[PDB]
C-alpha cells in the first residue's frame, strides 16, 4: 500500500531516535549509507523523506554496538531491521496502520529501543 510512505517516514523517525541516544551518552552515531535510488537516481524523481539507507551507533573505537536499516524504495517485501553485531541478534520492524511500528505483534516504542541500545553499549561497546 502507501504504507510504504509511512514506513519511510517512520524510518526517518527511528533514525532520529538513534541520533538522540547518541548525543545523550556521549557515544558516537554514524550515517552509514544513502539510497542508490537517490544517488544514482539522476534526473529521476525522488519523493522519499530522506535519502538515507544505513546507520549505526559506534563506541569510542568506532566498532558499532548497534545497527539499523530500511529497504530501498524499489524492493519487494519491505522491512526495516535491527542487528546487534557479534551477538547474533536480529529484529524485524513492520508497520501496522493505526497501531504503529511493530516487531511482529509487539509494538516498537522509542523506550524499548533506548533500553536495547543501553544493553548494547554496556555489553558490546569496547570503549
Amino acid at each position: 500500500a502507501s504504507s510504504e510512505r509511512e514506513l519511510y517516514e517512520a524510518w526517518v523517525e527511528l533514525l532520529s531516535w538513534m541520533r538522540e541516544y547518541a548525543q545523550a551518552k556521549g557515544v558516537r552515531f554514524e550515517k552509514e549509507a544513502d539510497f542508490p535510488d537517490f544517488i544514482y537516481r539522476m534526473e529521476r524523481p525522488y519523493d522519499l523523506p530522506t535519502t538515507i539507507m544505513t546507520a549505526s551507533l559506534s563506541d569510542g573505537l568506532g566498532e558499532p554496538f548497534l545497527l539499523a536499516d530500511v529497504s530501498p524504495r524499489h524492493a519487494k517485501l519491505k522491512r526495516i531491521g535491527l542487528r546487534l553485531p557479534r551477538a547474533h541478534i536480529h529484529l524485524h520492524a513492520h508497520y501496522e496502520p493505526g497501531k504503529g511500528l511493530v516487531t511482529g505483534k509487539i509494538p516498537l516504542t522509542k523506550e524499548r529501543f533506548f533500553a536495547l541500545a543501553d544493553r548494547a553499549r554496556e555489553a558490546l561497546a569496547f570503549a
Partner: protein, 240 residues
Amino acid sequence: MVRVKVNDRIVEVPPGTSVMDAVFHAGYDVPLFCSEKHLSPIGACRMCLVRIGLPIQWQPKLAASCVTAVADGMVVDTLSDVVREAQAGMVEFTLLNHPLDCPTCDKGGACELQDRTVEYGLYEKYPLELPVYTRFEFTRRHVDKHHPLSPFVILDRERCIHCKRCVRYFEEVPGDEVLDFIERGVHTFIGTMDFGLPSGFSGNITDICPVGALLDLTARFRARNWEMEETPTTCALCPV
C-alpha cells in the same frame, strides 16, 4: 610429467598440479576468488569450477579446479554450455548481497569481481529478447561500512565475498590471526578483537582482497586505478 588435456589443447604438467593451474597452463581461464597465489586452495568461493574426465567417462559433479589434483591422462572442460552456465551462477550468488559502489569504490578499475563478472557473467540464454540483469528483487545485506582498522587500513564488511583470502593469509603467511569471520550463514563478517591490526605485514590483504572490502588508507580517495602513472621500482628502505 602428467599428461592432461584442457578443452582443445594438450599439456605436459607435473603430478601435484592444481587442475586450475593445468587449465591456465593450457592458456585457458576460469573464475578465481578464494584461491590465490601462495595460498591454500579451498574450494570456497567455488568459482574455479570445471569438469573432469578419467578414462569418455565424465565425473558426476563439478571439480573445483583450484582444489582438485590432476591425474594421469585427465580431461578438463572449461567452455561447455553447462559450465559457463554454472560459472555465471556462482557469480550471481556472489553479486547477490553486494553494496553497489563501483563509481565511488576505491577498488575502481581493477577488481577481481568486476573483471570476472564482465568476463564470465550473464550466460547467453536462448533474438533481441529484453533480458534482466537481476532476479533477486529483495533487500540486500547491510552492515558496518568504511571502518578504520588501523591508521593504515580500512574495512567495508558489505563488499567482502567471504573467500578466505585475508584470514587464510593471516594464519598461513605472516602467522598473526588478527582477522577472522564472526557469525555464520549470510550473517558472516570480518572483524577483529586485536584492534591495532598489530602485524607489520597487515597491508598485503589490501592487495589480496578480490574486492574493495580491504583498502589502503594512506592512499584512500586519491585517483582511480587506471589514472595513476605507475612507476615500477625497487624499495631502498632496507637490504632485501
